[PDB]
Design a protein around this ligand. Structure first.
Ligand SMILES: [Zn+2]
Lengths: 58, 93, 81, 210
RNA sequence: AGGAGUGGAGUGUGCGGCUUAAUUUGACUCAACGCGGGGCAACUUACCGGCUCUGAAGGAUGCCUGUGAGUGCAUGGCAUGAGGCAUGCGGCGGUGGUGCAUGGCCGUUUUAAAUGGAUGGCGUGAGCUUUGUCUUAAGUUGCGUAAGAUGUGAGACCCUUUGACGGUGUUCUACGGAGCAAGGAGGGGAUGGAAGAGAACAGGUCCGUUAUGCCCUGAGAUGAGGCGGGCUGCACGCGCACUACGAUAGAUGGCGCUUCUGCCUGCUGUGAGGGAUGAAGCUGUGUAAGGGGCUUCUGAACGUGGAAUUCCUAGUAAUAGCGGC
């Protein structure tokens, strides 16, 4: 029959990194508490590294 | 306490190994040059010959006969010329 | 499916050291020594037959692979320094 | 039981490993194989006719058979030991001649010049007799069989198990598969190497009064 | 010459016909029909109805791709991190077709007894070496003959087991052998099997096989999974079986035990013989069952079967059973 397409993120990689004076990298969007500091969790209780396991609703 | 056990599928080459070891153990620590002869063991299967469903239907039963002899001669460190035989299934416990 | 590249170099290591391999043809389960699914090995060793590295000899639900001279000489320049 | 439950799983492994060696040793005159699964290293003996070509230089080709035979038997890497040998009489093996007639038919020779090249290699080795059969699409689209006998055979009896030697082979031409069967009668030998050390049961010889 | 039956009844399950969304198919005198080791709830499974996947070698040309190719996310933004899309030559898969393109293996004539070289002789030559006769399970032996000897097959051999050989006496013989006795653990191929030259058949199998030529099929695939249905449908014709039609019997007890399919026996004097079909209630296996068991009730057809017709010579036929697959 037919299948569904997808949407991609080209510039959204720069979520909140704010290049400031002294290279003050402003990091927002706190990551999964049960995972590394680099895996920024999805908004509203969803995570990314775990397919759906990490769910931090705050 | 030595205990030699034999077993194999053909018998014309199990009697040789139970006679070639007759003389190379005669003049040694042990004696009573004899070997018990237990009764054999049998395993059977019955099947159809026809490879489809045509003809007269014809059956045939196969057998796996197994002879086996025993040895009981207590000695102390008296061998590897037993391990040089092609078909007999030597056992040494 | 796309066999992950971390698994491809795993397989080309066993072919160098041992120079052989034995693959039970099914889809379920894992390889005994390599802990990789049988379905990754079956997809990947269809490309080492087109190139001309190994040769398969299938017998009784098992396929035995054997390395070849052109294959042994080729894997040197990728895993030997 | 116990003995008749391992003697059938042992033999069920000899039927498969023997099925692989004769495919990876096609062009080397493979004759037989023998498996003894009670040792420290599991012995495996191979009788062939090209020892310095099945092994390969540096034994690169022998250290592959040892790793594939250890994966199958489920043992450590260095717990199995392959030993190569060489046939005594190349001309008396019925499975070596069955493949020599088969490498010719892939070589453009006709099946008459190829069969007779394998009937006189059984005379020179002093065999009592030898029969050959060829059946397929030999020269067209209608199939037939042809026999070629050059001696004395024996078909019924109990000695047939010891005095005959069989061998099959098939060739995959551009038309379709062809069959080949070879049967050889081994000569009586009192020592027991070339042929058996048994006289046939219906031979009576009367001594001399001296 | 005899014994037990089949063909008639009710059930078990194979085949035809009709029907159906589909009721997947092969085999048709012997030599198709409880046969495909074919006792199918799923799987088996080849068929029918929806849904999901690719489990799509590698080159070539155009196009797109680290400034993100794709993939998992029960919800839409993060996570992983290198191939994708379009044409074609090709590799690969198929219980898709042809057994009248083949191999291998089975069946049938054959449970028969038949055949191949070389010497001599006979024919210009192919070619023949015959048509007898006694005995045997047997071209198995013996005689007669322009023929005399040697192989394969039968026998010996093997499962297998006390040197048992028509040996001894007796009655017939063509000197090949046959009957009847004794003695004997065993008697006339010691019993029963296994085996079985060289030819033939358009015999059966491509649905058994990573056996195989050619044709057919290729992503909304004739490939791979998952779920329901079917192969078990029922006016009728046929083949193999199981249970009966009763007193030489049925019911109920006792005796034998780790044995047995027997033995003794208060009731029934005849539809208390027979046990199909259906009802209500209890239970086992399994993901799924009014299929499988048990208890009370219901209780058919059947009164030893028309023309035809099958198997059988002794520890066998027929009766009653227990193992295994
Ligand atoms: Zn997380």
């Amino acid at each position: 029959a037919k299948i569904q397409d997808k949407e991609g993120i080209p510039p959204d990689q720069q979520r909140l990194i704010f290049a400031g004076k002294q290279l003050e990298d402003g990091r927002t969007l706190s990551d999964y508490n049960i995972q590394k500091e680099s895996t920024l969790h999805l908004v509203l209780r969803l995570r990314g590294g775990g397919a759906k396991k990490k769910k931090k609703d705050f | 306490k030595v205990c030699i056990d034999m077993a194999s599928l053909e018998e014309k080459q199990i009697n040789k190994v139970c006679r070639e070891f007759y003389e190379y153990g005669k003049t040694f620590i042990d004696d009573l040059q004899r070997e018990t002869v237990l009764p054999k063991k049998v395993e059977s299967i019955t099947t159809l010959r026809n490879p489809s469903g045509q003809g007269t239907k014809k059956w045939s039963r196969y057998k796996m006969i197994v002879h086996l002899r025993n040895f009981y001669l207590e000695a102390t460190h008296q061998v590897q010329f037993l391990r040089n035989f092609p078909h007999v299934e030597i056992n040494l416990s | 499916m796309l066999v992950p590249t971390a698994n491809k170099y795993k397989i080309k290591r066993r072919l160098l050291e041992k120079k052989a391999l034995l693959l039970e043809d099914t889809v379920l389960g894992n390889h005994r020594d390599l802990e990789i699914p049988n379905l990754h090995l079956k997809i990947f060793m269809k490309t080492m037959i087109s190139y001309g590295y190994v040769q398969r000899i299938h017998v009784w639900r098992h396929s035995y692979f054997l390395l070849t001279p052109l294959g042994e000489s080729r894997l040197r320049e990728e895993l030997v320094f | 039981d116990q003995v008749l439950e391992r003697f059938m799983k042992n033999g069920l492994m000899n039927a498969e490993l023997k099925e692989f060696f004769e495919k990876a040793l096609v062009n080397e005159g493979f004759s037989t194989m023998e498996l003894r699964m009670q040792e420290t290293p599991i012995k495996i003996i191979l009788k062939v006719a090209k020892p310095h070509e099945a092994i390969g230089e540096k034994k690169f080709r022998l250290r592959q058979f040892q790793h594939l035979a250890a994966q199958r038997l489920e043992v450590p890497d260095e717990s199995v030991e392959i030993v190569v040998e060489k046939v005594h009489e190349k001309g008396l093996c019925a499975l070596i001649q069955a493949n020599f007639i088969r490498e010719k038919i892939l070589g453009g020779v006709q099946y008459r010049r190829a069969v007779n090249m394998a009937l006189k290699t059984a005379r020179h080795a002093k065999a009592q007799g030898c029969q050959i059969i060829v059946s397929g699409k030999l020269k067209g689209q209608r199939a037939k069989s042809v026999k070629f006998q050059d001696g004395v055979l024996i078909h019924s009896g109990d000695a047939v198990k010891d005095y005959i030697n069989t061998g099959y082979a098939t060739v995959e031409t551009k038309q379709g598969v062809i069959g080949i069967q070879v049967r050889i009668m081994l000569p009586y030998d009192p020592e027991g190497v070339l042929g058996p050390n048994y006289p046939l049961p219906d031979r009576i010889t009367i001594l001399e009064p001296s």
